[PDB]
């Protein structure tokens with residue numbers, strides 16, 4: 018039994034007193050509120066909030082039975098007796114406390130009937146997690162396939178079909194019960210830690226996500242090279258093997274930006290060496306030369322590191338001496354028995370641990386390392402009596418990887434202010450995207466079921482802040498022989514998901530260059546396609562930095578008033594314009610694609626489909642997976658290069674999918690130097706915009722460029738615009754007032770400036786796109 022006693026306004030926050038204690042309500046923006054219970058007491062600080070100190074001016078009003086605390090769009094309605102807070106956007110009820118806060122830490126809320134709930138981070142349970150209960154304790158799930166209640170990267174957060182996100186801003190071992198035990202109750206629980214939640218509201222899913230990343234953090238633009246081709250396995254055993262792999266990409270004509278070194282870079286065995294954090298010189302004898310030789314070919318080197326220092330490692334005595342390891346209650350370094358052997362964990366929450374670990378990353382980065390892979394950050398083993406500077410293991414567990422990322426990000430920015438950090442990690446917390454975290458879905462089995470789960474995992478993580486969530490392409494764990502069809506399908510899917518990193522245990526090759534002739538003939542043009550599409554992908558990345566819009570978007574974005582689409586995990590959007598349906602079983606001869614109402618083109622064949630609502634059935638083939646292009650799309654391409662270090666946009670090729678059903682369309686292409694972390698902040702970019710206006714007798718394109726440019730930006734780009742489904746009735750083209758005849762023959766066979774191909778229904782315009790505005794008008 019709880020009731021309101023009294024309140025006050027202090028530094029813009031509402032502090033309420035009940036019979037049980039203080040409750041602090043601070044608006045972190047007009048659409049987001051932090052509710053801290055036990056506000057009087059000492060607690061762990063917020064991990065989820067980018068600006069935990071902020072509180073914007075809100076309006077407070079009082080009635081007999083209630084208080085009302087409001088920002089722009091979000092309102093807290095505080096019932097006094099009994100005490101219960103509920104939340105409104107306009108006058109629409111978003112979420113209501115049932116018992117609310119109790120004692121262990123426990124929050125209880127009502128779920129509305131029919132409300133669907135996404136959330137929890139990585140689980141394989143279905144997109145709507147209502148009816149499920151699961152722990153909040155990051156933990157490995159080696160060899161998962163088609164089911165998991167608990168894996169590497171949980172998030173104490175949910176997204177509802179009422180268009181709110183609720184964050185449990187707590188780092189401890191806990192649980193979430195989403196109307197499982199009691200059908201109308203959402204229950205959040207933890208053994209300890211901060212007793213706070215954060216509610217964020219939005220008018221649409223895009224703007225919900227914008228509001229969420231506003232308060233939790235925006236991912237800084239990764240380096241363009243993160244969108245390229247990675248060579249990775251577990252693991253290259255030597256410098257010779259690593260050089261041979263870079264050579265294999267060159268001799269097989271596959272693009273390659275980055276080679277990834279797993280744990281053999283620091284010792285010859287899986288066990289016994291972890292914590293060395295230095296080169297195994299028997300097997301990597303000249304590593305500075307190795308890395309420099311790779312940079313000459315435009316190839317970056319990424320190294321694996323882990324949180325654990327073994328007692329057999331060369332750095333045990335030094336870490337103990339520096340007080341860098343987590344301790345037992347007696348105050349000594351805690352040691353425990355990992356797979357790898359007996360060892361400790363670096364205390365990233367301490368000053369000494371942070372300085373010690375940072376110094377090692379600084380040293381190796383000085384040697385030539387371009388980026389970093391932090392594995393086992395759950396932490397994979399984390400005994401409960403381990404003591405970190407700010408709490409015990411069970412209290413801090415779900416924030417360890419988050420602080421690891423923060424530490425490393427700040428260190429990389431301090432060492433290289435002019436470069437974008439690359440940080441790939443397996444486990445984090447809400448807001449870890451602000452430290453550049455690029456997560457992957459862990460040790461997936463080499464099975465169709467492991468592939469079939471990747472879209473679900475990717476969308477769940479994308480929706481709550483993680484644009485660059487990806488998988489070990491081709492699968493990671495076990496297998497005795499390559500499943501060639503599954504491998505091909507996983508790497509085709511790869512092209513249309515955030516990071517192109519095939520990776521597997523090295524008894525079966527993960528890299529496409531080591532595959533048979535048929536597999537390489539299929540995949541080589543697709544990996545080249547990934548490079549030709551960099552302007553599309555990099556522009557979606559730019560949008561993710563600006564607004565949190567994920568790269569992969571769920572089918573349900575296409576119709577916000579049809580909540581049944583929330584269940585789909587088999588088709589998704591890659592950027593604005595491509596509806597992708599990965600093939601996730603062997604021998605599938607056709608697929609039924611639940612395309613939204615409108616006009617759609619076969620990405621591979623140019624075929625036009627119109628649909629009222631009924632799904633489209635497309636046949637399948639082994640060389641592609643089904644991709645449809647939305648009418649009104651602008652798809653930008655550049656020529657394929659071997660490495661993004663060679664990237665040029667001097668030549669553009671843009672494909673516009675015309676249909677009279679889309680009278681107005683827009684596209685953009687974001688160009689910058691691909692490496693400067695301050696490019697967007699300082700407007701050191703070239704933002705190309707394109708607008709189409711499509712009426713009965715004309716098709717008009719308006720082209721423009723903004724921003725201050727960047728060093729090496731071409732002043733003039735040779736541009737080929739290919740208009741698919743173009744009317745055969747266009748008589749002439751006006752370019753900036755200058756009339757040009759449209760040729761009706763020999764388009765492919767003459768240096769034609771405007772040419773209509775009657776057999777393909779494609780009108781091709783070739784022109785120079787300079788810094789001034791350009792208008793292209795086609796008239797019947």
Ligand SMILES: OC[C@@H]1[C@@H](O)[C@H](O)[C@@H](O)[C@H]2N[C@@H]12
Nearest residue numbers: 250251279280321392459460
């Ligand atoms: O470090 C070896 C291996 C790594 O390649 C995978 O990416 C990780 O998830 C952990 N299983 C380990």
Ligand SMILES: O=C([O-])C(=O)[O-]
Nearest residue numbers: 677713743744745746
């Ligand atoms: O729709 C058009 O503009 C046409 O096909 O002629």
